[PDB]
Each structure stands twice: as C-alpha cells, then as structure tokens.
mmCIF file of all heavy atoms in Angstrom:
data_model
loop_
_atom_site.group_PDB
_atom_site.id
_atom_site.type_symbol
_atom_site.label_atom_id
_atom_site.label_comp_id
_atom_site.label_asym_id
_atom_site.label_seq_id
_atom_site.Cartn_x
_atom_site.Cartn_y
_atom_site.Cartn_z
ATOM 1 N N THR A 1 -42.082 16.943 -24.565
ATOM 2 C CA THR A 1 -42.699 16.744 -25.890
ATOM 3 C C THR A 1 -41.965 17.677 -26.839
ATOM 4 O O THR A 1 -41.666 18.814 -26.481
ATOM 5 C CB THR A 1 -44.210 17.134 -25.861
ATOM 6 O OG1 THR A 1 -44.945 16.109 -25.182
ATOM 7 C CG2 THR A 1 -44.783 17.322 -27.259
ATOM 8 N N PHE A 2 -41.688 17.216 -28.056
ATOM 9 C CA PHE A 2 -40.976 18.024 -29.030
ATOM 10 C C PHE A 2 -41.905 18.492 -30.136
ATOM 11 O O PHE A 2 -42.776 17.751 -30.592
ATOM 12 C CB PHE A 2 -39.820 17.243 -29.681
ATOM 13 C CG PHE A 2 -38.732 16.881 -28.711
ATOM 14 C CD1 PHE A 2 -38.741 15.654 -28.082
ATOM 15 C CD2 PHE A 2 -37.688 17.766 -28.464
ATOM 16 C CE1 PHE A 2 -37.728 15.308 -27.170
ATOM 17 C CE2 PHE A 2 -36.676 17.425 -27.590
ATOM 18 C CZ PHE A 2 -36.679 16.190 -26.960
ATOM 19 N N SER A 3 -41.655 19.699 -30.624
ATOM 20 C CA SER A 3 -42.481 20.265 -31.692
ATOM 21 C C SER A 3 -41.558 20.951 -32.708
ATOM 22 O O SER A 3 -40.445 21.289 -32.370
ATOM 23 C CB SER A 3 -43.424 21.317 -31.128
ATOM 24 O OG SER A 3 -42.717 22.419 -30.575
ATOM 25 N N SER A 4 -42.032 21.107 -33.945
ATOM 26 C CA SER A 4 -41.292 21.879 -34.946
ATOM 27 C C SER A 4 -42.203 22.172 -36.082
ATOM 28 O O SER A 4 -43.117 21.374 -36.340
ATOM 29 C CB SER A 4 -40.136 21.055 -35.510
ATOM 30 O OG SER A 4 -39.319 21.833 -36.342
ATOM 31 N N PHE A 5 -41.968 23.292 -36.784
ATOM 32 C CA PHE A 5 -42.652 23.522 -38.067
ATOM 33 C C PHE A 5 -41.984 22.747 -39.209
ATOM 34 O O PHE A 5 -42.586 22.607 -40.272
ATOM 35 C CB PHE A 5 -42.624 24.997 -38.437
ATOM 36 C CG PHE A 5 -43.613 25.837 -37.694
ATOM 37 C CD1 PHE A 5 -43.294 26.399 -36.462
ATOM 38 C CD2 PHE A 5 -44.882 26.058 -38.205
ATOM 39 C CE1 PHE A 5 -44.197 27.191 -35.785
ATOM 40 C CE2 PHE A 5 -45.795 26.847 -37.500
ATOM 41 C CZ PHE A 5 -45.434 27.411 -36.312
ATOM 42 N N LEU A 6 -40.736 22.300 -39.003
ATOM 43 C CA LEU A 6 -39.920 21.694 -40.050
ATOM 44 C C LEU A 6 -39.972 20.178 -40.039
ATOM 45 O O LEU A 6 -39.598 19.519 -39.069
ATOM 46 C CB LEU A 6 -38.471 22.153 -39.979
ATOM 47 C CG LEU A 6 -38.090 23.486 -40.645
ATOM 48 C CD1 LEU A 6 -38.847 24.622 -40.035
ATOM 49 C CD2 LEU A 6 -36.585 23.783 -40.565
ATOM 50 N N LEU A 7 -40.429 19.615 -41.145
ATOM 51 C CA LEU A 7 -40.470 18.167 -41.300
ATOM 52 C C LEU A 7 -39.082 17.538 -41.238
ATOM 53 O O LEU A 7 -38.936 16.408 -40.766
ATOM 54 C CB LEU A 7 -41.138 17.748 -42.612
ATOM 55 C CG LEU A 7 -42.642 17.823 -42.650
ATOM 56 C CD1 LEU A 7 -43.090 17.309 -44.052
ATOM 57 C CD2 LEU A 7 -43.281 17.010 -41.520
ATOM 58 N N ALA A 8 -38.056 18.234 -41.715
ATOM 59 C CA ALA A 8 -36.697 17.698 -41.604
ATOM 60 C C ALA A 8 -36.373 17.431 -40.150
ATOM 61 O O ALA A 8 -35.755 16.427 -39.824
ATOM 62 C CB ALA A 8 -35.629 18.704 -42.185
ATOM 63 N N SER A 9 -36.755 18.386 -39.296
ATOM 64 C CA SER A 9 -36.514 18.295 -37.864
ATOM 65 C C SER A 9 -37.432 17.236 -37.226
ATOM 66 O O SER A 9 -37.020 16.546 -36.312
ATOM 67 C CB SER A 9 -36.674 19.666 -37.187
ATOM 68 O OG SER A 9 -35.751 20.614 -37.696
ATOM 69 N N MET A 10 -38.644 17.080 -37.738
ATOM 70 C CA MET A 10 -39.531 16.021 -37.256
ATOM 71 C C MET A 10 -38.940 14.651 -37.575
ATOM 72 O O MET A 10 -39.027 13.708 -36.779
ATOM 73 C CB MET A 10 -40.902 16.153 -37.909
ATOM 74 C CG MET A 10 -41.622 17.466 -37.605
ATOM 75 S SD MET A 10 -42.092 17.707 -35.722
ATOM 76 C CE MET A 10 -40.563 18.101 -34.873
ATOM 77 N N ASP A 11 -38.352 14.538 -38.761
ATOM 78 C CA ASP A 11 -37.696 13.300 -39.161
ATOM 79 C C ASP A 11 -36.498 12.976 -38.278
ATOM 80 O O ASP A 11 -36.281 11.830 -37.899
ATOM 81 C CB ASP A 11 -37.321 13.336 -40.667
ATOM 82 C CG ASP A 11 -38.532 13.274 -41.572
ATOM 83 O OD1 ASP A 11 -39.666 13.078 -41.061
ATOM 84 O OD2 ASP A 11 -38.357 13.409 -42.819
ATOM 85 N N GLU A 12 -35.718 13.984 -37.942
ATOM 86 C CA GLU A 12 -34.592 13.793 -37.018
ATOM 87 C C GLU A 12 -34.996 13.336 -35.643
ATOM 88 O O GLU A 12 -34.390 12.411 -35.057
ATOM 89 C CB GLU A 12 -33.813 15.076 -36.865
ATOM 90 C CG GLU A 12 -32.716 15.210 -37.844
ATOM 91 C CD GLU A 12 -31.754 16.321 -37.449
ATOM 92 O OE1 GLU A 12 -32.156 17.490 -37.493
ATOM 93 O OE2 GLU A 12 -30.606 16.011 -37.088
ATOM 94 N N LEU A 13 -36.026 13.985 -35.117
ATOM 95 C CA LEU A 13 -36.561 13.598 -33.814
ATOM 96 C C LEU A 13 -37.088 12.165 -33.830
ATOM 97 O O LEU A 13 -36.894 11.412 -32.876
ATOM 98 C CB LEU A 13 -37.639 14.584 -33.386
ATOM 99 C CG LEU A 13 -37.212 15.989 -32.994
ATOM 100 C CD1 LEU A 13 -38.436 16.913 -32.972
ATOM 101 C CD2 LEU A 13 -36.521 16.004 -31.617
ATOM 102 N N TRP A 14 -37.746 11.770 -34.910
ATOM 103 C CA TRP A 14 -38.304 10.418 -35.006
ATOM 104 C C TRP A 14 -37.191 9.366 -34.831
ATOM 105 O O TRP A 14 -37.370 8.348 -34.169
ATOM 106 C CB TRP A 14 -39.018 10.248 -36.336
ATOM 107 C CG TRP A 14 -39.499 8.876 -36.615
ATOM 108 C CD1 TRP A 14 -40.617 8.253 -36.123
ATOM 109 C CD2 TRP A 14 -38.842 7.930 -37.443
ATOM 110 N NE1 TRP A 14 -40.694 6.982 -36.610
ATOM 111 C CE2 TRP A 14 -39.609 6.753 -37.421
ATOM 112 C CE3 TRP A 14 -37.652 7.962 -38.198
ATOM 113 C CZ2 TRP A 14 -39.236 5.607 -38.146
ATOM 114 C CZ3 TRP A 14 -37.278 6.831 -38.923
ATOM 115 C CH2 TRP A 14 -38.069 5.667 -38.889
ATOM 116 N N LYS A 15 -36.031 9.638 -35.387
ATOM 117 C CA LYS A 15 -34.925 8.693 -35.301
ATOM 118 C C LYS A 15 -34.249 8.750 -33.952
ATOM 119 O O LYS A 15 -33.754 7.735 -33.472
ATOM 120 C CB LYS A 15 -33.871 8.989 -36.377
ATOM 121 C CG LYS A 15 -34.308 8.730 -37.822
ATOM 122 C CD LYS A 15 -33.083 8.670 -38.760
ATOM 123 C CE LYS A 15 -33.425 8.028 -40.128
ATOM 124 N NZ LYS A 15 -33.745 6.553 -40.038
ATOM 125 N N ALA A 16 -34.210 9.945 -33.360
ATOM 126 C CA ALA A 16 -33.442 10.213 -32.147
ATOM 127 C C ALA A 16 -34.125 9.964 -30.808
ATOM 128 O O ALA A 16 -33.434 9.784 -29.802
ATOM 129 C CB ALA A 16 -32.958 11.662 -32.160
ATOM 130 N N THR A 17 -35.449 10.022 -30.746
ATOM 131 C CA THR A 17 -36.127 9.938 -29.453
ATOM 132 C C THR A 17 -37.464 9.276 -29.596
ATOM 133 O O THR A 17 -38.079 9.337 -30.663
ATOM 134 C CB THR A 17 -36.289 11.347 -28.782
ATOM 135 O OG1 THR A 17 -36.815 11.192 -27.460
ATOM 136 C CG2 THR A 17 -37.216 12.291 -29.575
ATOM 137 N N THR A 18 -37.869 8.600 -28.525
ATOM 138 C CA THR A 18 -39.165 7.985 -28.438
ATOM 139 C C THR A 18 -40.158 8.931 -27.770
ATOM 140 O O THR A 18 -41.321 8.573 -27.622
ATOM 141 C CB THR A 18 -39.090 6.698 -27.606
ATOM 142 O OG1 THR A 18 -38.477 7.015 -26.351
ATOM 143 C CG2 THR A 18 -38.243 5.683 -28.334
ATOM 144 N N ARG A 19 -39.711 10.131 -27.368
ATOM 145 C CA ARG A 19 -40.613 11.125 -26.785
ATOM 146 C C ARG A 19 -41.683 11.572 -27.771
ATOM 147 O O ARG A 19 -41.481 11.488 -28.967
ATOM 148 C CB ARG A 19 -39.838 12.346 -26.253
ATOM 149 C CG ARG A 19 -38.831 12.028 -25.099
ATOM 150 C CD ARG A 19 -39.541 11.354 -23.922
ATOM 151 N NE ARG A 19 -40.650 12.174 -23.456
ATOM 152 C CZ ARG A 19 -41.689 11.750 -22.731
ATOM 153 N NH1 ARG A 19 -41.803 10.494 -22.345
ATOM 154 N NH2 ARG A 19 -42.638 12.604 -22.404
ATOM 155 N N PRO A 20 -42.830 12.042 -27.267
ATOM 156 C CA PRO A 20 -43.861 12.478 -28.189
ATOM 157 C C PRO A 20 -43.407 13.649 -29.032
ATOM 158 O O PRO A 20 -42.660 14.483 -28.543
ATOM 159 C CB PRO A 20 -44.994 12.908 -27.273
ATOM 160 C CG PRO A 20 -44.725 12.211 -25.960
ATOM 161 C CD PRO A 20 -43.252 12.211 -25.872
ATOM 162 N N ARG A 21 -43.869 13.670 -30.289
ATOM 163 C CA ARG A 21 -43.593 14.728 -31.258
ATOM 164 C C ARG A 21 -44.908 15.290 -31.802
ATOM 165 O O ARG A 21 -45.890 14.538 -31.961
ATOM 166 C CB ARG A 21 -42.798 14.173 -32.444
ATOM 167 C CG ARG A 21 -41.391 13.668 -32.127
ATOM 168 C CD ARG A 21 -40.888 12.625 -33.158
ATOM 169 N NE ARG A 21 -41.563 11.312 -33.039
ATOM 170 C CZ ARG A 21 -42.395 10.773 -33.941
ATOM 171 N NH1 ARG A 21 -42.632 11.359 -35.095
ATOM 172 N NH2 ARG A 21 -42.975 9.602 -33.694
ATOM 173 N N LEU A 22 -44.913 16.586 -32.119
ATOM 174 C CA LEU A 22 -46.041 17.186 -32.821
ATOM 175 C C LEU A 22 -45.531 18.160 -33.889
ATOM 176 O O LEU A 22 -44.605 18.929 -33.640
ATOM 177 C CB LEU A 22 -47.044 17.849 -31.884
ATOM 178 C CG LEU A 22 -46.736 19.206 -31.280
ATOM 179 C CD1 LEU A 22 -47.242 20.329 -32.139
ATOM 180 C CD2 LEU A 22 -47.314 19.364 -29.876
ATOM 181 N N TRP A 23 -46.186 18.103 -35.047
ATOM 182 C CA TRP A 23 -45.863 18.934 -36.198
ATOM 183 C C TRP A 23 -46.716 20.176 -36.169
ATOM 184 O O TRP A 23 -47.954 20.128 -36.141
ATOM 185 C CB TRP A 23 -46.063 18.145 -37.482
ATOM 186 C CG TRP A 23 -45.670 18.921 -38.719
ATOM 187 C CD1 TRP A 23 -44.696 19.846 -38.835
ATOM 188 C CD2 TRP A 23 -46.275 18.794 -40.011
ATOM 189 N NE1 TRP A 23 -44.664 20.342 -40.126
ATOM 190 C CE2 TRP A 23 -45.638 19.709 -40.859
ATOM 191 C CE3 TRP A 23 -47.294 17.983 -40.523
ATOM 192 C CZ2 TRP A 23 -45.975 19.832 -42.213
ATOM 193 C CZ3 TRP A 23 -47.633 18.115 -41.838
ATOM 194 C CH2 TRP A 23 -46.976 19.021 -42.678
ATOM 195 N N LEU A 24 -46.033 21.308 -36.142
ATOM 196 C CA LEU A 24 -46.662 22.621 -36.208
ATOM 197 C C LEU A 24 -46.880 22.965 -37.652
ATOM 198 O O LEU A 24 -45.915 23.042 -38.455
ATOM 199 C CB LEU A 24 -45.748 23.654 -35.568
ATOM 200 C CG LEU A 24 -45.486 23.434 -34.060
ATOM 201 C CD1 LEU A 24 -44.291 24.293 -33.568
ATOM 202 C CD2 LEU A 24 -46.762 23.760 -33.313
ATOM 203 N N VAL A 25 -48.153 23.153 -37.985
ATOM 204 C CA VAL A 25 -48.606 23.394 -39.377
ATOM 205 C C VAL A 25 -49.043 24.856 -39.497
ATOM 206 O O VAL A 25 -50.086 25.279 -38.941
ATOM 207 C CB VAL A 25 -49.747 22.440 -39.710
ATOM 208 C CG1 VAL A 25 -50.310 22.708 -41.138
ATOM 209 C CG2 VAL A 25 -49.285 20.967 -39.571
ATOM 210 N N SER A 26 -48.242 25.653 -40.199
ATOM 211 C CA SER A 26 -48.504 27.076 -40.355
ATOM 212 C C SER A 26 -49.760 27.335 -41.192
ATOM 213 O O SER A 26 -50.147 26.488 -42.010
ATOM 214 C CB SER A 26 -47.331 27.758 -41.040
ATOM 215 O OG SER A 26 -47.192 27.234 -42.353
ATOM 216 N N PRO A 27 -50.400 28.499 -41.003
ATOM 217 C CA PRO A 27 -51.540 28.858 -41.874
ATOM 218 C C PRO A 27 -51.252 28.669 -43.383
ATOM 219 O O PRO A 27 -52.124 28.157 -44.103
ATOM 220 C CB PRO A 27 -51.847 30.318 -41.471
ATOM 221 C CG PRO A 27 -51.476 30.316 -39.964
ATOM 222 C CD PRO A 27 -50.169 29.507 -39.950
ATOM 223 N N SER A 28 -50.051 29.051 -43.830
ATOM 224 C CA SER A 28 -49.635 28.924 -45.251
ATOM 225 C C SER A 28 -49.594 27.495 -45.734
ATOM 226 O O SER A 28 -50.130 27.161 -46.794
ATOM 227 C CB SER A 28 -48.246 29.533 -45.440
ATOM 228 O OG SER A 28 -48.347 30.913 -45.314
ATOM 229 N N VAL A 29 -48.948 26.634 -44.961
ATOM 230 C CA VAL A 29 -48.898 25.214 -45.275
ATOM 231 C C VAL A 29 -50.320 24.610 -45.292
ATOM 232 O O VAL A 29 -50.688 23.901 -46.226
ATOM 233 C CB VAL A 29 -47.909 24.452 -44.312
ATOM 234 C CG1 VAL A 29 -48.018 22.925 -44.454
ATOM 235 C CG2 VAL A 29 -46.451 24.926 -44.579
ATOM 236 N N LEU A 30 -51.138 24.949 -44.286
ATOM 237 C CA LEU A 30 -52.479 24.378 -44.182
ATOM 238 C C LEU A 30 -53.331 24.791 -45.378
ATOM 239 O O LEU A 30 -54.063 23.982 -45.930
ATOM 240 C CB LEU A 30 -53.168 24.833 -42.883
ATOM 241 C CG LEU A 30 -54.609 24.323 -42.608
ATOM 242 C CD1 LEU A 30 -54.697 22.779 -42.629
ATOM 243 C CD2 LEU A 30 -55.103 24.847 -41.253
ATOM 244 N N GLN A 31 -53.229 26.067 -45.752
ATOM 245 C CA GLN A 31 -54.001 26.631 -46.854
ATOM 246 C C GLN A 31 -53.562 26.099 -48.202
ATOM 247 O O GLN A 31 -54.396 25.840 -49.078
ATOM 248 C CB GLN A 31 -53.876 28.162 -46.857
ATOM 249 C CG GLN A 31 -54.508 28.850 -48.097
ATOM 250 C CD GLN A 31 -54.937 30.286 -47.845
ATOM 251 O OE1 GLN A 31 -54.663 31.170 -48.659
ATOM 252 N NE2 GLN A 31 -55.609 30.529 -46.722
ATOM 253 N N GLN A 32 -52.253 25.932 -48.367
ATOM 254 C CA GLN A 32 -51.705 25.535 -49.661
ATOM 255 C C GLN A 32 -51.690 24.035 -49.887
ATOM 256 O O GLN A 32 -52.182 23.553 -50.900
ATOM 257 C CB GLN A 32 -50.371 26.217 -49.818
ATOM 258 C CG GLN A 32 -50.519 27.713 -49.875
ATOM 259 C CD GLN A 32 -49.215 28.392 -49.857
ATOM 260 O OE1 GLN A 32 -48.185 27.829 -50.262
ATOM 261 N NE2 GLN A 32 -49.211 29.629 -49.336
ATOM 262 N N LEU A 33 -51.152 23.263 -48.954
ATOM 263 C CA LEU A 33 -51.323 21.817 -49.050
ATOM 264 C C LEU A 33 -52.774 21.399 -48.959
ATOM 265 O O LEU A 33 -53.178 20.419 -49.607
ATOM 266 C CB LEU A 33 -50.587 21.066 -47.952
ATOM 267 C CG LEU A 33 -49.162 20.611 -48.230
ATOM 268 C CD1 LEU A 33 -48.282 21.750 -48.658
ATOM 269 C CD2 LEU A 33 -48.628 19.945 -46.963
ATOM 270 N N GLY A 34 -53.545 22.133 -48.160
ATOM 271 C CA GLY A 34 -54.926 21.738 -47.840
ATOM 272 C C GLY A 34 -54.917 20.657 -46.749
ATOM 273 O O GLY A 34 -53.913 19.978 -46.574
ATOM 274 N N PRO A 35 -56.031 20.493 -46.009
ATOM 275 C CA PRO A 35 -56.028 19.559 -44.896
ATOM 276 C C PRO A 35 -55.787 18.104 -45.263
ATOM 277 O O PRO A 35 -55.153 17.393 -44.510
ATOM 278 C CB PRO A 35 -57.408 19.753 -44.257
ATOM 279 C CG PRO A 35 -58.215 20.463 -45.240
ATOM 280 C CD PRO A 35 -57.295 21.248 -46.075
ATOM 281 N N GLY A 36 -56.297 17.672 -46.416
ATOM 282 C CA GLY A 36 -56.100 16.294 -46.843
ATOM 283 C C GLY A 36 -54.637 15.936 -46.974
ATOM 284 O O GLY A 36 -54.210 14.901 -46.436
ATOM 285 N N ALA A 37 -53.883 16.826 -47.641
ATOM 286 C CA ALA A 37 -52.436 16.629 -47.876
ATOM 287 C C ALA A 37 -51.625 16.868 -46.615
ATOM 288 O O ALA A 37 -50.548 16.245 -46.439
ATOM 289 C CB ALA A 37 -51.933 17.500 -48.990
ATOM 290 N N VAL A 38 -52.082 17.769 -45.750
ATOM 291 C CA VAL A 38 -51.406 17.921 -44.445
ATOM 292 C C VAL A 38 -51.482 16.596 -43.684
ATOM 293 O O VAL A 38 -50.493 16.114 -43.137
ATOM 294 C CB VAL A 38 -51.976 19.067 -43.595
ATOM 295 C CG1 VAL A 38 -51.511 18.945 -42.094
ATOM 296 C CG2 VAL A 38 -51.596 20.428 -44.176
#
C-alpha cells in the first residue's frame, strides 16, 4: 500500500499503480482546509 502527504505524489501513484493508496493529512492541512475541503 502506498502513502504520501503530497498530492503531487498521490497523483503520480494513481497513474502508475493499481495498488491501494492513502493520503496522509497533516494537522495543519486538516485544520486549515477543514474536514469538508479535505
């Protein structure tokens, strides 16, 4: 399973592999985007 904090890297993985992916959402991103936008 692949993980990353970086959406650029999540986008790369999406194109490159059918393996499961998960986005790591930092406290800062969660607090600032808020859960709806995350």
